């Protein structure tokens, strides 16, 4: 009766048996039901394992990472069946659980805070991001020349893609800007960019847990899950929580309709729909259209995802947004080192910047540093789960989305300069 | 407030819906889907909830959304994209099964180990007796109207005895499509219509049996999200096992093919009796089922009205023939459960209400409608055994019936 996943070993065995029956008989619906079934079980076991591996389990960050890495190794080693990969992929992409997840988090995180606090951060945050970029560039250029690599490459094939807001946000559009300005094939760029950015993404998740340990070892640096130094609710029901779900989706829809047809770009920046959402939700908070009861509902919902479904999510993240074969194709000692150091440049860059802006250095280096250099949205979840600061999702998204859009403007200029 | 959202807030959402609508910008995925489904379901849910005649016997809040939604597809009110988004949630993502899976699990695990085991020996047989009587009378009156027996079982008997909209119409269409291959909407539209007619007769005879009756005289506390989350694990994992069983291990017990949902009922029921789940977890599954049945039910109907309903066919099968056939099947259940219960040691009137009318009624909403018509509201617990477990039994029987026919 020693529990796995709040399920006693006997009960878990029943499920683990079922998983294996589906696995060996090759019978599985490639849908939500089939997906969650597998994801829950697989996540559960490796979650616990990673939670209790001695060296491997350090801080809180051991459990989310295990599932993620393990799951990727299952795809790479072909342990998953094609139908299983399809089922998981169907939940993450075709059904689009990923966005929902982030949407729920953002909504719940923003609707919990006071209206007075809101605008106070945003003004000091963006500069911190730029500080992180400077540091990411300064260190990149520095290490580039150590390896005898021209600076242009460092900015175009190393720095910019890493800091860029992920696969869809950076690799996809940075190859577009590359082709528009150079004329050389997108694949030539993308293939190198996507590969290297994923390497850095793995370092980002590692250093996230390292900064966690350094934060709890040197309390002066850490805010213990809070970036800024600095109505009570009645009883809650399912309906309030359910309303949280309505608001989570409907806010994403509005943001989507805005970024597609109404206000696709404010200026030189194209605003990614998630960025709009943050502004919409924040606006919705200040408008106070949501009563405290409902505002809690959104929080409560966010908890259910971030604490129950987080393990599930990682199984999906390790499958879809981590091609271990493309990494291998660019694991020359050189890239591994260059990439890692650029991340460290972002860490120190955002640490110093935030410290100057009034935020806690550890949190600043995570939100404005590692969350830039990670693989955008999928990455943010991977990083924030490694340092147990999942409540900063909203900030992480500002860097990955708005900060990613900034990378594009900078990129265009860099490309033009050559 | 609309759907627990104050009118100002709901407006914000309703505005957004219309922006997505007019601008034709909508992700054809879960997020986009639920966004629309929540909002649309919310308004028409309230509308159908406020309507006087319609709420009490027409099914009300759910029926509004499911009919309205169908009219939106038929009248082309929805955009291709919007239909795609909703369909993407219901089929490609397969929310429908998850929904049913969660319900089944929560409904079966909520029955106490003793209640379940004890109920099987006496109450459960009475239910089966009611079904026999419901079938025998149905078949009998079918031929009187020159109706083939297969129709009597598939389009009349089974759907009536099946517990409700979510529990019978929704999954019986699923089993119908999985075994015949014909559209769900063809079945659903006829089934949902007939079953509601019978539901109205059930509430009438409940008051008639009341007059005839008077004329002829371990419960745990600390449930957390994890427990509820475990409910979700068990809901899916139990469906997976059932799926693996139907597809390779035991696709058919004999010449008859057991549909995976039927297996699930047996698996979950087994899991209950095995007591592998502690009361805390067993509640978690219940709580989950509540969240779906009470929050996401409105959403579900928006989806059901889009994919699972054709208006012409459904409008057409409103024939006086149905009125009579349906009523008599109910009477067959009454006499079936009356005789059975009398043989089992229960009072015939009470047996015919709980194991008879509560089967033929519209699942849970129905039980409340029936038990309030005969003042026997204290038998809610029994009524729900019929609507939930007995409904799950109807599914196993239904698979066998379908297989035998084809
Ligand atoms: C104008 C800027 C609007 C977006 C602000 C996003 C930050 C709100 O985010 C919230 O802030 C809290 C206070 O730091 C944290 O405790 C919460 O975990 C975090 O989610
Ligand atoms: Na990045
Ligand atoms: Na019924």
For B238-266, give one letter per residue: b (16+ CB within 10 A) or e: bbbbbbbbbbeeeeeeeeebbbbbbbbbb
- The ligand that comes nearest to the alpha carbon of residue B360 is 3
Burial class (CB in 10 A: 0-12, 13-18, 19+), A83: middle
Q: Of A105, A107, A111, A113, which is best to mutate to test ligand 1, by the most ligand atoms within 8 angstroms of its C-beta?
A: A113
Contacts of A169 (CB under 8 A, 6+ apart): A272, A376, A400, A401, A404, A405
Which of B4, B29, B278 has the CB atom closest to A243's CB atom? B4
Is the CB of residue B33 less than 8 Å from the CB of residue B86?
yes
- Quote the number of domains for chain B: 1
Indicate the helix (H) or strand (E) that contains A14.
helix A9-24
Supply the range of the domain harboring residue A313: 1-418
For B112-138, give one letter per residue: b (16+ CB within 10 A) or e: eeeebeebeeebbbbbbbbbbbbbebb
How far is the C-alpha of A142 from the C-alpha of B48, rounded, in Å?
Answer: 68
> Ligand 1: which residue has its CA nearest to atom 20?
A109
Please identify which residue in the block is written with the tokens 């970024």: A259
How far is the C-alpha of A122 from the C-alpha of A129, rounded, in Å?
Answer: 11
CA-based nearest residue to B5, from A231, A247, A272: A247
Residues forming a β-bridge with B252 = B257
Which of A7, A33, A289 has the CB atom closest to B9's CB atom? A289
How far is the C-alpha of A403 from the C-alpha of A367, rounded, in Å?
Answer: 11
Phi first, then psi: what are they for A266, rounded to 5°? -65, -40
- The ligand that comes nearest to the alpha carbon of residue B394 is 3
Q: How near does any CA of chain B get to the CA of A417, in Å?
A: 37
For A164-181, give one letter per residue: b (16+ CB within 10 A) or e: bbbbebbbbbbbebbbeb
**CB pairs A-B closer than 8 Å:** 216
Residues forming a β-bridge with B2 = B5
Residues ending a continuous segment of chain B before a break (C–N > 2.5 Å)? 217
Mark which residues 217-276 of B lie under 8 Å from A by CB: 224-230, 232-234, 236-241, 243-244, 247-249, 271, 276
What was the structure determination method? X-ray
How far is the C-alpha of B303 from the C-alpha of A374, rounded, in Å?
Answer: 37
Mark which residues 30-69 of A lie under 8 Å from B by CB: 31-34, 36-38, 40-41, 44
Is the CB of residue A372 less than 8 Å from the CB of residue A132?
yes
CB contact under 8 A, A95 and B98: no
Ramachandran bin of B88, using left for φ above 0, alpha for ψ from -120 to 50, beta for the remaining angles: alpha
**Tokens linked to A187:** 């694949």
- The ligand that comes nearest to the alpha carbon of residue B169 is 3
Q: How near does any CA of chain B get to the CA of A245, in Å?
A: 9
Q: Which residues in chain B touch residue A97, judged by CB atoms under 8 angstroms apart?
A: 30
Three-state SS for A4? strand
Pocket of ligand 1 (CB under 6 A): A 109-110, 113, 118-119, 121-122, 226-228, 278, 282, 391-392, 394-395
Is the CB of residue B352 less than 8 Å from the CB of residue B346?
no
Ramachandran bin of B363, using left for φ above 0, alpha for ψ from -120 to 50, beta for the remaining angles: left
């Amino acid at each position: 009766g020693f529990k796995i996943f709040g399920m006693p070993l006997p009960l878990y065995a029943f499920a683990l048996i079922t998983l294996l029956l589906s696995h060996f008989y090759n019978a599985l619906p490639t849908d939500i039901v089939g997906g969650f079934a597998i994801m829950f079980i697989i996540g559960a076991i490796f979650g616990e394992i990673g939670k209790r591996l001695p060296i491997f389990n350090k801080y809180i960050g051991g459990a989310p990472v295990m599932i993620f890495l393990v799951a990727a190794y299952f795809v790479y080693a072909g342990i998953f069946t094609q139908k299983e990969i399809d089922a998981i992929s169907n939940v993450m992409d075709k059904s689009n659980f990923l966005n929902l997840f982030i949407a729920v988090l953002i909504t719940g995180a923003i609707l919990s805070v006071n209206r007075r606090l809101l605008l106070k951060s945003l003004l000091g945050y963006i500069p911190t991001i730029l500080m992180g970029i400077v540091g990411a560039s300064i260190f990149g250029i520095a290490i580039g020349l150590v390896f005898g690599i021209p600076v242009d490459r460092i900015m175009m094939l190393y720095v910019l893609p890493i800091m860029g807001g992920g696969n869809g946000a950076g690799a996809v559009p940075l190859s577009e800007i590359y082709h528009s300005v150079t004329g050389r094939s997108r694949e030539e760029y993308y293939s190198t960019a996507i590969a290297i950015l994923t390497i850095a993404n793995i370092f980002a998740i590692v250093f996230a847990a390292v900064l966690d340990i350094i934060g709890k070892k040197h309390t002066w640096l850490s805010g213990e899950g809070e970036l800024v130094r600095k109505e009570k609710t009645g009883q809650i029901t399912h309906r309030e929580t359910a309303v949280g779900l309505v608001l989570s989706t409907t806010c994403f829809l509005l943001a989507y309709v805005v970024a597609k047809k109404i206000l696709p770009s404010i200026g030189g920046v194209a605003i990614h729909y998630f960025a709009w959402m943050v502004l919409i939700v924040a606006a919705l908070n200040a408008s106070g259209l949501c009563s405290p009861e409902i505002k809690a509902g959104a929080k409560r919902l966010s908890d259910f995802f971030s604490k129950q479904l987080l393990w599930v999510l990682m199984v999906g993240v390790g499958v879809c947004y981590t091609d271990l074969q493309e990494i291998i194709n660019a694991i020359t000692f050189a890239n591994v080192v260059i990439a890692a150091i650029i991340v460290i440049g972002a860490v120190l860059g955002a640490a110093i910047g935030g410290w100057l802006m009034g935020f806690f250095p550890i949190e600043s280096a995570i939100t404005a540093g590692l969350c830039m250099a990670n693989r955008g949205g999928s990455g943010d979840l991977e990083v924030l789960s490694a340092c147990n600061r999942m409540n900063l999702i909203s900030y992480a998204q500002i860097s990955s989305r708005l900060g990613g859009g900034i990378v594009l403007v900078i990129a265009s200029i860099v490309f033009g300069m050559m």
